[PDB]
Each structure stands twice: as C-alpha cells, then as structure tokens.
Amino acid sequence: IVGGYTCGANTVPYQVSLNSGYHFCGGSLINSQWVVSAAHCYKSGIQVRLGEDNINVVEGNEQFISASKSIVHPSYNSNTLNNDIMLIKLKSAASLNSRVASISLPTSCASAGTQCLISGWGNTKSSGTSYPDVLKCLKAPILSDSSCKSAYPGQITSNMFCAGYLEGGKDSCQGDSGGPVVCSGKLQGIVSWGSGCAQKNKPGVYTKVCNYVSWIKQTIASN
Ligand SMILES: CCCCCC
Ligand SMILES: [Ca+2]
Incomplete structure (x- = not known):
C-alpha cells in the first residue's frame, strides 16, 4: 500500500496472506473454510496464513493452513484480467475469534x-x-x-x-x-x-x- x-x-481479521515461502498475494476470509483472492495470484503449494500482523515474525494469533483447492474463475482472461477472482478452500477450518474473522x-x-x-x-x-x-x-x-x-x-x-x-x-x-x-x-x-x-x-x-x-x-x- x-x-x-x-x-x-x-x-x-479477515485479511489473509498467501504464502509460498514468502508473501505473494493477499486474500479475504469469507467463512471458516474459504478464502477469496485474485485469479492472477494462482499458484500451486499455497499456504494460507491467518491472524497475521508482522509476516516475518511469529507473534501469536497466527494460523497456518494449507490450501486444499484453488478454484480460478473459468472465464478468467490473463491478458485483460477480466474475471480476476479465485476461491481457495482450506484443508481444515480456521478457528474464528477476535483476531480471525470472516x-x-x-x-x-x-x-x-x-x-x-x-x-x-x-x-x-x-x-x-x-x-x-x-x-x-x-x-x-x-x-x-x-x-x-x-x-x-x-x-x-x-x-x-x-x-x-x-x-x-x-x-x-x-x-x-x-x-x-x-x-x-x-x-x-x-x-x-x-x-x-x-x-x-x-x-x-x-x-x-x-x-x-x-x-x-x-x-x-x-x-
Ligand atoms: C511455507 C511452509 C511450507 C508450505 C508453504 C509455505
Ligand atoms: Ca507473524
């Protein structure tokens, strides 16, 4: 920003960090098991990091959950970015609290x-x-x-x-x-x-x- x-x-609380050994894209938690992000952020081996503030330090409140499935919108066009939306299913449900919410x-x-x-x-x-x-x-x-x-x-x-x-x-x-x-x-x-x-x-x-x-x-x- x-x-x-x-x-x-x-x-x-709804902000997530898409991690693959480093932060590459953001996301939004919409329920305990699904995140919404951009289709152009698609990549295999995604780990969703919830409850993050300092992304380089473990401070408490973090929840690291592997992406179980990434669904890029079928009509996504990489040249125009039309339909730049993707859904990510979490392997296990996140624990919702004050720090992590949809x-x-x-x-x-x-x-x-x-x-x-x-x-x-x-x-x-x-x-x-x-x-x-x-x-x-x-x-x-x-x-x-x-x-x-x-x-x-x-x-x-x-x-x-x-x-x-x-x-x-x-x-x-x-x-x-x-x-x-x-x-x-x-x-x-x-x-x-x-x-x-x-x-x-x-x-x-x-x-x-x-x-x-x-x-x-x-x-x-x-x-
Ligand atoms: C980053 C821990 C291993 C899975 C990818 C973050
Ligand atoms: Ca952290």
Missing part, C-alpha cells in the same frame, strides 16, 4: 463515492521498492465509471471498478493483489491491477465482487 498507514495488529459478501453493489478500506503487505513505494513487515491500510473512495473508463480507455469491463485518488500518492500496489476492498462491512472488491502504483490519473482497478456473489455461493455449495 502506497501512502497508507499501519492498521494495527489484528484490526483487519467478512460478508455484498448484497448490492457499492456506488461511486463509497469510502472503503484497502489493506495488504504489498510494496509501499510507487517509484521503487519497499515491503513492510506489518499490515498497511488505506481509505479510498470508489470512483465513477466515467472517470474509470477515461483513465483506462477500453480496458475496464463491467466486472471492474476504479478506487483511489486521481492526484496520486495513495494506492494499492504489487503484493496487495488478491486483497480486500471493504465498504460498509462488505467485501466489494479484490485488488487486481493498475498502471504502476500511486500514479497521477491512474487509479487502482479492482474486481467487482458483487457481480460474483451467486457464482461464489454456487461454487462453494458444490465443493
């Missing part, structure tokens, strides 16, 4: 202007590289589709939305992918892509979760 702030230990799926889509919380352990430098040990947070409003499509002409699909600041300085970044965009206690987006990080006139693009609520429920129900 570029231009964000330290969330504080376990203040974002986030709710939206009932309706969010409107332009809705303020959301974006979090992750991604790069904190727009021009350069710096990875944090602890979880960073950022408050960002959902932008209007007109401004979004104006920023990325012909690249925004009905399954994406822009969130952030057109003046730059605050945005998600590499390493934040797959992470949650929570608005009014509802998971509205998944960190997907952007042109660089915190660049002027180049907001972050996120997977529009409200379009997939039925897909999620049906897939989970049959697996």
Whole structure:
C-alpha cells in the first residue's frame, strides 16, 4: 500500500496472506473454510496464513493452513484480467475469534463515492521498492465509471471498478493483489491491477465482487 498507514495488529481479521515461502498475494476470509483472492495470484503449494500482523515474525494469533483447492474463475482472461477472482478452500477450518474473522459478501453493489478500506503487505513505494513487515491500510473512495473508463480507455469491463485518488500518492500496489476492498462491512472488491502504483490519473482497478456473489455461493455449495 502506497501512502497508507499501519492498521494495527489484528484490526483487519479477515485479511489473509498467501504464502509460498514468502508473501505473494493477499486474500479475504469469507467463512471458516474459504478464502477469496485474485485469479492472477494462482499458484500451486499455497499456504494460507491467518491472524497475521508482522509476516516475518511469529507473534501469536497466527494460523497456518494449507490450501486444499484453488478454484480460478473459468472465464478468467490473463491478458485483460477480466474475471480476476479465485476461491481457495482450506484443508481444515480456521478457528474464528477476535483476531480471525470472516467478512460478508455484498448484497448490492457499492456506488461511486463509497469510502472503503484497502489493506495488504504489498510494496509501499510507487517509484521503487519497499515491503513492510506489518499490515498497511488505506481509505479510498470508489470512483465513477466515467472517470474509470477515461483513465483506462477500453480496458475496464463491467466486472471492474476504479478506487483511489486521481492526484496520486495513495494506492494499492504489487503484493496487495488478491486483497480486500471493504465498504460498509462488505467485501466489494479484490485488488487486481493498475498502471504502476500511486500514479497521477491512474487509479487502482479492482474486481467487482458483487457481480460474483451467486457464482461464489454456487461454487462453494458444490465443493
Ligand atoms: C511455507 C511452509 C511450507 C508450505 C508453504 C509455505
Ligand atoms: Ca507473524
């Protein structure tokens, strides 16, 4: 997260870290056995780390659980990032408590202007590289589709939305992918892509979760 702030230990209980010997993508716990992330984060040998603050130190509250199955959306397109969503089934159910909790799926889509919380352990430098040990947070409003499509002409699909600041300085970044965009206690987006990080006139693009609520429920129900 570029231009964000330290969330504080376990203040974002639904945030997960996708680990393969290092942190590569974020995720959101939606129930005791399922995590939602980005399709472009897919990789074999994933271990889901719950209750994390400092990802480089064991401080207590962590739960390491192996991914039992990763379901990339069948219509995911790696070139356009359309349908950039993936479900991860945990080998065993997580123990829910104060430090580890699930986030709710939206009932309706969010409107332009809705303020959301974006979090992750991604790069904190727009021009350069710096990875944090602890979880960073950022408050960002959902932008209007007109401004979004104006920023990325012909690249925004009905399954994406822009969130952030057109003046730059605050945005998600590499390493934040797959992470949650929570608005009014509802998971509205998944960190997907952007042109660089915190660049002027180049907001972050996120997977529009409200379009997939039925897909999620049906897939989970049959697996
Ligand atoms: C990282 C412990 C072994 C499985 C991959 C994290
Ligand atoms: Ca830790």
